Amino acid sequence: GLFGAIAGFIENGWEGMVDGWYGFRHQNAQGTGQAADYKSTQAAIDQITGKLNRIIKKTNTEFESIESEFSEIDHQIGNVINWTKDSITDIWTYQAELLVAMENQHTIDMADSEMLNLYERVRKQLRQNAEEDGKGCFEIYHACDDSCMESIRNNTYDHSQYREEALLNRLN
Amino acid sequence: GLFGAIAGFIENGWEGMVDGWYGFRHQNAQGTGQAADYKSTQAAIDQITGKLNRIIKKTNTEFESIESEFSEIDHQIGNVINWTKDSITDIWTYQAELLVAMENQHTIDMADSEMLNLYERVRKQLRQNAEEDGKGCFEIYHACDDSCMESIRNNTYDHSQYREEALLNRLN
Amino acid sequence: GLFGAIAGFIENGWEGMVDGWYGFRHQNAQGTGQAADYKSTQAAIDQITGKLNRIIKKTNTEFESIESEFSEIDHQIGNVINWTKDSITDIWTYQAELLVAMENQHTIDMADSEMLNLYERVRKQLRQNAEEDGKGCFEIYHACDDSCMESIRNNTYDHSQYREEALLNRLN
Amino acid sequence: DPDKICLGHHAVANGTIVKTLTNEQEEVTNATETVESTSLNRLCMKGRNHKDLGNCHPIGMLIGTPACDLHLTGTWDTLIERKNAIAYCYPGATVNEEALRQKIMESGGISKINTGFTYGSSINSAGTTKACMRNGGNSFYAELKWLVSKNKGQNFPQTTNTYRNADTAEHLIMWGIHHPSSTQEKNDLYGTQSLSISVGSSTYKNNFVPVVGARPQVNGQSGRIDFHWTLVQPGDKITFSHNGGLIAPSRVSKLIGRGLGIQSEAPIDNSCESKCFWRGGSINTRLPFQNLSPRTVGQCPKYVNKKSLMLATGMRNVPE
Amino acid sequence: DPDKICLGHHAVANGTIVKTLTNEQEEVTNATETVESTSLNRLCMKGRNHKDLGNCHPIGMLIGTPACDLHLTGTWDTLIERKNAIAYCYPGATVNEEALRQKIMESGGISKINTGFTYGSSINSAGTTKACMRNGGNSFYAELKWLVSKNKGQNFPQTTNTYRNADTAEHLIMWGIHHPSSTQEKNDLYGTQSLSISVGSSTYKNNFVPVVGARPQVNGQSGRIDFHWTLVQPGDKITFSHNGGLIAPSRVSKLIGRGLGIQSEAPIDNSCESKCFWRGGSINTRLPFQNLSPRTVGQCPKYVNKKSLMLATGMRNVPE
Amino acid sequence: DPDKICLGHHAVANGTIVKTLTNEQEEVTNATETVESTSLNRLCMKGRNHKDLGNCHPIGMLIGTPACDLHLTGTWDTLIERKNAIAYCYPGATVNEEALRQKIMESGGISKINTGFTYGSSINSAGTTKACMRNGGNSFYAELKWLVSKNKGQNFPQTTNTYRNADTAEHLIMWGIHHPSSTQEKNDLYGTQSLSISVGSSTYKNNFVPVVGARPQVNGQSGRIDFHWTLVQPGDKITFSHNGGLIAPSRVSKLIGRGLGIQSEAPIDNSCESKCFWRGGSINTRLPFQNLSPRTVGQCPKYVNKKSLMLATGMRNVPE
Ligand SMILES: CC(=O)N[C@@H]1[C@@H](O)[C@H](O[C@@H]2O[C@H](CO[C@]3(C(=O)O)C[C@H](O)[C@@H](NC(C)=O)[C@H]([C@H](O)[C@H](O)CO)O3)[C@H](O)[C@H](O)[C@H]2O)[C@@H](CO)O[C@H]1O
Ligand SMILES: CC(=O)N[C@@H]1[C@@H](O)[C@H](O[C@@H]2O[C@H](CO[C@]3(C(=O)O)C[C@H](O)[C@@H](NC(C)=O)[C@H]([C@H](O)[C@H](O)CO)O3)[C@H](O)[C@H](O)[C@H]2O)[C@@H](CO)O[C@H]1O
Ligand SMILES: *[C@@H]1O[C@H](CO)[C@@H](O[C@@H]2O[C@H](CO)[C@@H](O)[C@H](O)[C@H]2NC(C)=O)[C@H](O)[C@H]1NC(C)=O
Ligand SMILES: CC(=O)N[C@H]1[C@H]([C@H](O)[C@H](O)CO)O[C@@](O)(C(=O)O)C[C@@H]1O
Ligand SMILES: *[C@@H]1O[C@H](CO)[C@@H](O)[C@H](O)[C@H]1NC(C)=O
Ligand SMILES: *[C@@H]1O[C@H](CO)[C@@H](O)[C@H](O)[C@H]1NC(C)=O
Ligand SMILES: [Ca+2]
Ligand SMILES: [Ca+2]
Numbered sequence A, B, C: 001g002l003f004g005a006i007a008g009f010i011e012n013g014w015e016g017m018v019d020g021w022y023g024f025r026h027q028n029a030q031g032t033g034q035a036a037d038y039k040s041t042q043a044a045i046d047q048i049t050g051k052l053n054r055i056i057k058k059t060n061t062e063f064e065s066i067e068s069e070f071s072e073i074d075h076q077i078g079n080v081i082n083w084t085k086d087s088i089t090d091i092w093t094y095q096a097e098l099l100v101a102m103e104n105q106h107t108i109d110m111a112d113s114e115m116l117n118l119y120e121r122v123r124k125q126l127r128q129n130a131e132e133d134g135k136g137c138f139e140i141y142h143a144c145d146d147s148c149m150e151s152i153r154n155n156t157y158d159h160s161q162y163r164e165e166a167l168l169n170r171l172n
Numbered sequence D, E, F: 001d002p003d004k005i006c007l008g009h010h011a012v013a014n015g016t017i018v019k020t021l022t023n024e025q026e027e028v029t030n031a032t033e034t035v036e037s038t039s040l041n042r043l044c045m046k047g048r049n050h051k052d053l054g055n056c057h058p059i060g061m062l063i064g065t066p067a068c069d070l071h072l073t074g075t076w077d078t079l080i081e082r083k084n085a086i087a088y089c090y091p092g093a094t095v096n097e098e099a100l101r102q103k104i105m106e107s108g109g110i111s112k113i114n115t116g117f118t119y120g121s122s123i124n125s126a127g128t129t130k131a132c133m134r135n136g137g138n139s140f141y142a143e144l145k146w147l148v149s150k151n152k153g154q155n156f157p158q159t160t161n162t163y164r165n166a167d168t169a170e171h172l173i174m175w176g177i178h179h180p181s182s183t184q185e186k187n188d189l190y191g192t193q194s195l196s197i198s199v200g201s202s203t204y205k206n207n208f209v210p211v212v213g214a215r216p217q218v219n220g221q222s223g224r225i226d227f228h229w230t231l232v233q234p235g236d237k238i239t240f241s242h243n244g245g246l247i248a249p250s251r252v253s254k255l256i257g258r259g260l261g262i263q264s265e266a267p268i269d270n271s272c273e274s275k276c277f278w279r280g281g282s283i284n285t286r287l288p289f290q291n292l293s294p295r296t297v298g299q300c301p302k303y304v305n306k307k308s309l310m311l312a313t314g315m316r317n318v319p320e
Helices: A005-009 A036-055 A076-128 A146-153 A160-170 B003-010 B038-055 B075-129 B146-153 B159-171 C005-009 C038-055 C074-129 C146-153 C159-171 D068-071 D097-106 D183-190 E065-071 E097-106 E183-190 F066-071 F096-107 F185-190
Strands: A024-030 A031-036 A130-132 A136-138 B020-026 B033-037 B130-132 B137-138 C020-028 C030-034 C130-132 C139-140 D003-008 D016-018 D026-028 D030-031 D050-052 D076-081 D108-115 D123-127 D128-135 D138-140 D146-149 D157-163 D172-180 D199-202 D205-208 D224-232 D237-242 D246-249 D251-255 D261-263 D276-278 D310-312 E003-009 E016-018 E024-030 E031-033 E050-052 E078-081 E109-114 E123-129 E130-132 E137-139 E145-148 E160-165 E171-179 E199-200 E205-210 E226-230 E237-242 E245-249 E251-256 E260-263 E276-278 E310-312 F002-010 F015-018 F026-028 F031-035 F048-052 F078-081 F111-112 F123-127 F128-136 F135-138 F144-149 F159-164 F170-181 F195-200 F207-208 F225-232 F237-242 F247-249 F251-255 F260-263 F276-279 F310-312
Touching: A005 A076, A005 C074, A024 A036, A024 A076, A024 A146, A031 A146, A036 A076, A036 D310, A036 F078, A076 A130, A076 A136, A076 A160, A076 B075, A076 B130, A076 C074, A076 D003, A076 D310, A130 C074, A130 D261, A160 E016, B003 B075, B020 B038, B020 B075, B020 B146, B033 B146, B033 C038, B038 B075, B038 E310, B075 B130, B075 B159, B075 C005, B075 C074, B075 C130, B075 D097, B075 E003, B075 E024, B075 E310, C005 C074, C020 C038, C020 C146, C038 C074, C038 D276, C038 F310, C074 C130, C074 C146, C074 C159, C074 F002, C074 F026, C074 F310, D003 F159, D016 D310, D030 E137, D050 F144, D068 D128, D076 D097, D097 D251, D097 D261, D146 D172, D224 D237, D237 D246, D251 E137, E003 F128, E016 E310, E024 F096, E065 E130, E078 E097, E097 E251, E097 E260, E109 F207, E137 E160, E145 E171, E145 E183, E226 E237, E245 F031, E310 F225, F015 F310, F078 F096, F096 F251, F096 F260, F144 F170, F144 F185
Parallel strands: D050 D076, D076 D261, E050 E078, E078 E260, F048 F078, F078 F260
Antiparallel strands: A024 A031, A024 D003, A130 A136, A136 D003, B020 B033, B020 E003, B130 B137, B137 E003, C020 C030, C020 F002, C130 C139, C139 F002, D016 D026, D030 D310, D108 D251, D123 D146, D128 D138, D146 D246, D157 D237, D172 D224, D172 D246, D172 D251, D199 D205, D199 D237, E016 E024, E031 E310, E109 E251, E123 E145, E130 E137, E145 E245, E160 E237, E171 E226, E171 E245, E171 E251, E199 E205, E199 E237, F015 F026, F031 F310, F111 F251, F123 F144, F128 F135, F144 F247, F159 F237, F170 F225, F170 F247, F170 F251, F195 F207, F195 F237
16 A cells, blocks of 8 residues: 555454554553554544545536437437437546545545554654564563553653663663 | 644644745754755645646637527527536536545645655654654754754765764763 | 655666566675565556556447538537537546546556555664665665575565674664 | 554454455445435425326316316426326327427416407307317317307308417417318318418417328327417417417416426325436435436436446455 | 754645545645636627627628628628627518527628629519618618519519529528518509419529518518528529519628627727637636636636635645 | 665666646656547448448438439448438438438338339329439339329329338338429429328328429429428328329338448448447547547547547656
């Protein structure tokens, strides 16, 4: 994908995560956890809502009958009408095929971008206290308890608190 | 947005900066400064100029009157004309709404991309001599005077000259 | 461009590289080398194939003649036909100009994205054993022989093997 | 040894295929349809002052065919024509038939105005036919009069009748011309002299010759009554110069405002609402496209040549 | 302790709302309009060899109505028709009126060619009317002659006139048929004989019988002169067989090249240029769309059902 | 000191310019054309049961002009009409000519059915002309008979002929009305009596008066034979009441199935296939657009006003 996050360096999605679109799994001494990210989930859903509002719509133009169902129309004007209607249908079929293809490409790449933007927000939070796994995980070079992990998710983690411990563990 | 820079990790824009679209603020012993980035500003403006050149245009096709303003047209052909004109207008209204929506999405995301690309160019210049703030700033781990700051903006900053000082200050 | 890789931090392309779209050059004690990346090349080609499949197509709609080549048509219906055909042609000309412009923008930015995604895959592999040059190269802080370089290209390079050597060389 | 925090996204076991610019078979977590395939075989007429003509053809309400007795006047915003609707009890055709029908179906009501026409004692204006039965007995079109002399075969007098439009809006006047099957039946109604019908207003002028010739029976009649019509402007008069064969109007028609004209076979449902209709029924979808019929009327989804177009409403589905 | 270098982007106090694929209310630093709402109530005719018909109706320049005397010939690239323009001084109608008008408005000039038609001593070709006044006194259409018997009541001679097209391009011939108001009037002008007008070419054939009957007065005349027209191909002849009631052409018309036909009420300005026109005036915008009128002519912005469509010309506006 | 690994992308010396949303002059590694400019000046007719009419006009196959003798019946899926194709040997026109031609070109075959029509001893049905020559001698349309009085000047008898459709599909009946050049000519052929031709079916009714008047010679004939046509539904009858001037059908036509109608001047090539045709020939492109002609028939690329539209098939070209 464009941004490399989804069907990219993240090997697969989580059927387990049913309370949001994007989120975190952590492991520490104390055990395991899972939590959805609201802000990034709602960002993706709001953008898709916006598309549905624009696309699920008809024109308010009133159209009258020009062909009769129950009688012959003049053969010459009948052929003109048939040629026009077929031409208009070819345009609308093309526009519909292009609209949905283009919007599908955007929806997929937008969702990829929201995943990457969350990963980058966390990378910059952890600063020198962690290293990139390569598969969307961060190896944290200090004791990070469930209160520490919650601080990472809530964007309140202060790197300077654990920096000295972390740099020692990293340099080894 | 797609690239996460504008309405993203950069918390807000600068009403102060009126001489360019993108730029730098620095703080050192010597005091404060502000300077716009030309190359990245002109890149964004050139791309928007290009759109206006393509979009602000009409077809050179000569159209004649088919309805009379001052006399009754045959009722049957009048209904055919009315159906055709209303169908063509529905298409052009749709195309116009889609063109501008799609181009607006691109303009916004393009401008975001130019911001990110500048930030990445600076990140790679500073190499191991600086660390990411998380809000679009770089904490530089050495004395950076107004001549040093100008070297970062002008893409002439050589990391190797301040490396030894910087790595010592970072490891502490 | 959008992703900054092509006509960006990579200064130019390689006319030398004729066996793929993206790839690697290395220099070590042992000498110089060049190799194309298959996975990333095929990813770009597959996406362009997909576009050509969608775009190189006509509708299967059968159209009949409504204008006669060899005789005069009624002047009133002739003017209606002329106005309709000119209106349909203006739409299809606009759609064709927009389709190709939009697809060209995407093709270029997609190819840029595949370059960046390869660079990021390698960055994360090398972890703390290398540093970013700024021009798309990685300075590797250990002895990397032709077998080591091949391991980087084949995504089998284990950072932990060379970590202690590399961190010593980097800190000096 | 070091604690780990992993980033990730949702997935589902049962994903949906959608088309993108680059990929025909792209699996995503959710999608919704943009093309309506389902129809309602009913005419959703809630919030609509509708009129179902049923057996009555729209032209029939202007001339007053037996089948159209309930539909001679009224106001509506929607008018529904059915298949094999009876325009004429007596065999015949209308000049610019399709133009007139389209005009009636566009309308939102019909008012009738008396022409006031009176006839001498020598003429009988109660002449009826077996083609148009009403109240068990022979009758005629309610808005026209067939009148003949007391002597069958006698030459029809060269009479002149004039209708004036006293109203501030244009009036639609219809009359008929009888075309006999043989020379015998041409002589018995209008006489031996050659028949000529002249119509004249400020904006309209035309001559009509009664054609006499053998032709097949329709509703057991070889004779034909073709209807003609024109608009009479406010304050203007229309003058009929005839020497027999002219079927004169008792009343003229006035079309009121605008309405939606539906040709369908589907039953009426007054519970559901709709703004889109076709031969097969109504289309109530919020969706922007449809593949039911290219012949639709009202505010409608656009017709496309596509079974389905799935719009992704979720990210790529990557399962474990 | 450590020095900082910060990256950022501009913002503005007064941002603009635009629509994107995903957001209806997106604030950006600048935007420009794509739909024109403003009109010019003038006809911008700079760099155009234009012809304002004013009081003259286009059909009038072929038959040569008094109002059209200045407009009987000449060349133009633009032709302007006005409201309530006069075509017929003497009351009458043209068969395929709209077809003929559209043909003239498409043209880029008119040339006249003399028919050469001469008449016997018994025929008077200088017949005039009070309905068509010229130089203060009674007159007639400049490109036609009213043929009547010299001696009141005398039978009109069976004359035959034939026009040949010597040119390499098609020529437009118009003639009229006079319809007298009374039997007495008919007899004084064309005699007691039954009237027949036969017209014949390789591509056209028709008979005309003058209808004679009382009718309301228009411009103080109960009589009617109805016009007919046809094209005469190069090298072909058209023959008029008549015994009275024919209004014969003195000259035939030749339409030259192509031109732009504008129906408008707006005054002319020779200072401004335009390629787009409508009833209400001109449209000079560089913008790609407009919501003034769906009835336009020339090279025009496309009509859309939108008050405004704002195109972002700057990044997201994120204020402090 | 340090080993390095560099990442990069291919380039080429000779790049291609393409247009993007933002840049008119963008250089890329490869591109392909989307608009076809090349034509084949031939009609690709492989896998097609085609019929080249050549000299024969489609209407001519129904009435049986000498030129159309080979083309009176048959089946096809493609029908090719040429320039200056002959429909009428004897001068005349067909009412709704264009409607009838379009109907024939839509068809996939013609069958003929005998009408069976018989005439009295006082009628001569073998009337021929020098305008329609066959086998060296004077002749007539193969599917019609010219009815004239056997004794010159004698009044034509009031005859009645009726065709019934015994078939399960609709039949196309054509007849002609002769228009004599002089009153003398009329009297010798059909007599002194006033002429009336009445045609009658369940769905069709019309009277025809032969117009008699002097007109130019076409193919050395001042007389005109104008054709009329209608569809006769299964089980229905059509009745001709005439007293002279009718050109009666010997056979009626039945149009079979569906076919593609091509008007072109280009030669036939039975080796190549195509689904798209125009005046100038065929269009075999897989490309989605074309700028050859807006007048095309079949499954066709859409016409655009563009010389070229280049679609990028590779990344930006940044050379060394
Ligand atoms: C057999 C006979 O000589 N006379 C009677 C027949 O009339 C009738 O058979 C049918 O006759 C039909 C036509 O008759 C009318 C009608 O429609 O009833 C008689 C009306 O008085 C006359 N009315 C008016 C206002 O003109 C009407 C009209 O002229 C025609 O409809 C115009 O075409 O004709 C018809 O021809 C049937 O096909 C025929 O069988 C029989 C049986 O009812 O009774 C006989 O006494
Ligand atoms: C000169 C002479 O005395 N006799 C012959 C002339 O008739 C002929 O000159 C032309 O005659 C034309 C009419 O000829 C036909 C025709 O169209 O060929 C002859 C047809 O047999 C007759 N057929 C029928 C069914 O009526 C046909 C028909 O009356 C008309 O077409 C009706 O409009 O007429 C015509 O009068 C020309 O003006 C004249 O030049 C010459 C020519 O070779 O031959 C003489 O033997
Ligand atoms: C074609 O459309 C126009 C407008 O939709 C119709 O014209 C209008 O008719 C009404 C009633 O006569 C007038 O009050 C309006 O002012 C007209 N509007 C315009 C813009 O002309 C017209 O009647 C339609 N034609 C047919 C044959 O249905
Ligand atoms: C040529 C000729 O005779 N012109 C005269 C006509 C006609 O005789 C008939 O009226 C037909 O309209 O009548 C007038 O009253 C008129 O119309 O102005 C006077 C005019 O001089
Ligand atoms: C329609 O357009 C063609 C090509 O521009 C032209 O030759 C033709 O005359 C036009 N027809 C009418 C009736 O204007
Ligand atoms: C990839 O390269 C490595 C490094 O030499 C090689 O040994 C291995 O066979 C390759 N891996 C796979 C899965 O083919
Ligand atoms: Ca057809
Ligand atoms: Ca034209």
